[PDB]
A paper describes a structure:
After identifying a distinct pattern whereby T-cells respond broadly to phospholipids in preference to sphingolipids, we solve the basis of this response via a ternary crystal structure of a [name]–phosphatidylcholine–[name] complex.
To characterize the extent of antigen and [name] remodeling during [name] [name] docking, we determined the crystal structures of the [name]-PC complex to 1.7 Å and the unliganded [name] [name] to 2.0 Å. The cationic cup observed here is pre-formed with the [name] α chain, whereas the PG90 cationic cup is formed by three variable loops in [name] α and β, and becomes a recognizable structure only after contact with [name]-phospholipid. The [name] [name] detectably interacted with [name] presenting the sphingolipid antigens, SM and sulfatide, but did so with extremely low affinity, 60.4 and 83.6 μM, respectively, as compared with [name]-phospholipids.
Author numbering:
A (entry chain B): 2 to 97, 101 to 244
B (entry chain A): 2 to 130, 132 to 150, 152 to 190
Write the structure that this text describes.
């Protein structure tokens, strides 16, 4: 840890420019920029062996880099193309433990039109009475639909506290229109608790979907609200 | 320099023995590594071996640097569901003054041992409502959840851990907008 990436998510129109920033306060001389794609593994774009120097990796075409200071390594996209839709990871190391320390990754999506960007609709489905009576357990389902790009973070909150145990979210969102190009996405999650915990009318359950959308410095000329970074939630009280 | 590791997804049941093969081709005497990538995270060093016959060990995993067979096979005696991740074999010349050569990565899926499988399909109504969803749950890990038409959506299986009761279960969700949509047929 200790390597930071800014932004964590970004949606871009084809032909538009952007800069990915990677910061580190471990006084590591070496910094790297990678991209990760299905079936292609982790591929090096560019790397730096020190302040001021940059060298080409395996896939440098379409990207530029800069190492103005030792702490920062910048990755530029001059004219974004749909082939540059990827997860980008930065890393750093100190030669002379010299393993690479990675950042959390940046999810980049290149779309033909920013009009295609949509926040999710979120709904919670209450546990089945048949499940409860047979198993003494209760599964709540959260469903997030109609969102584009697939830049979401789903989480469960029970009595105002973020829950991790008894939760499972789909590893990948599914395409609502598999045939189409700029299809919107759907993602489900489940939370399973004891039947007695669900039957308490004092217990509060909330599904939260953090959506990453347009930045403040993005042109918006459309009928609806600007699909900015927001939190879309759905909740349910425990029912006796 | 090159790193060739086991390809395609690996699926093991909980507590099974794991072996992820990794072979290299190197100029001199390189340092060898295993990186692990948990879902939705970056890579992190799992273990390493600086010299021949050295053994790296962490989180119940181990790998021996065999110079005779130019290999660094990863092994774990009893895999856990929490071990589901992408594993990367890697190498760099001694000192760390040069770039790292990574293998393609091996995706590991660890499926739970369901003690009492009881496949069941349930209908769930929206708290705010006339919307509904189907839940397929409590089936064994050898059950293949079939894919869907573009009007009926079916997720892949997902593993949930109810620690509070030392209990794990598999589930999948189905939903549709069609008026003639029954849970009894969804899965």
């Amino acid at each position: 840890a200790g390597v930071t990436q800014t932004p964590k998510f970004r949606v871009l129109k084809t032909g538009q420019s952007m800069t990915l920033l990677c910061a580190q306060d471990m006084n590591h001389e070496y910094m790297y920029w990678y991209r990760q794609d299905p079936g292609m593994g982790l591929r090096l774009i560019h790397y730096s062996v020190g302040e001021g120097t940059t060298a080409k990796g395996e896939v440098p075409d379409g990207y530029n880099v800069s190492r103005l200071k030792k702490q920062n390594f910048l990755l530029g996209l001059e004219s974004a193309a749909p082939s540059q839709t990827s997860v980008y990871f930065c890393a750093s190391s100190m030669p002379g433990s010299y393993e690479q320390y990675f950042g959390p990754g940046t999810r980049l999506t290149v779309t033909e039109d920013l009009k295609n960007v949509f926040p999710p609709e979120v709904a919670v489905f209450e546990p089945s009475e048949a499940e409860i009576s047979h198993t003494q357990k209760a599964t709540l389902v959260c469903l997030a639909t109609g969102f584009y790009p697939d830049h979401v973070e789903l989480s469960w909150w029970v009595n105002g506290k973020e829950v991790h145990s008894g939760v499972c979210t789909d590893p990948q969102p599914l395409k609502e229109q598999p045939a189409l190009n700029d299809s919107r996405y759907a993602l489900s999650s489940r939370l399973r608790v004891s039947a007695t915990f669900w039957q308490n009318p004092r217990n509060h359950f909330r599904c939260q979907v953090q959506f990453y959308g347009l930045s403040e410095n993005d042109e918006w000329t459309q009928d609806r609200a600007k699909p900015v970074t927001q939190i879309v939630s759905a909740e349910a009280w425990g029912r006796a | 320099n090159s790193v060739t590791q086991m390809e395609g997804p690996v699926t093991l049941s909980e507590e099974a023995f794991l072996t992820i093969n990794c072979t290299y081709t190197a100029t001199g005497y390189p340092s060898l590594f295993w990186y692990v990538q948990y879902p939705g995270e970056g890579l992190q060093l799992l273990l390493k071996a600086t010299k021949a016959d050295d053994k790296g060990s962490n989180k119940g995993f181990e790998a021996t640097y065999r110079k005779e067979t130019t290999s660094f096979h990863l092994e774990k005696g009893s895999v856990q569901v929490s071990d589901s991740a992408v594993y990367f074999c890697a190498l760099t010349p001694s000192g760390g003054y040069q770039k790292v050569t990574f293998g393609t990565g091996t995706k590991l899926q660890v499926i739970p041992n369901i003690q009492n499988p009881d496949p069941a399909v349930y209908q769930l109504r929206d708290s705010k409502s006339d919307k509904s969803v189907c839940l397929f749950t409590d089936f064994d890990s050898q059950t293949n959840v079939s894919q869907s038409d573009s009007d009926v959506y079916i997720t892949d299986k997902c593993v949930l851990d109810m620690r509070s009761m030392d209990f794990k279960s598999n589930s999948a969700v189905a939903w549709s907008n069609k008026s003639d949509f029954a849970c009894a047929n969804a899965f």
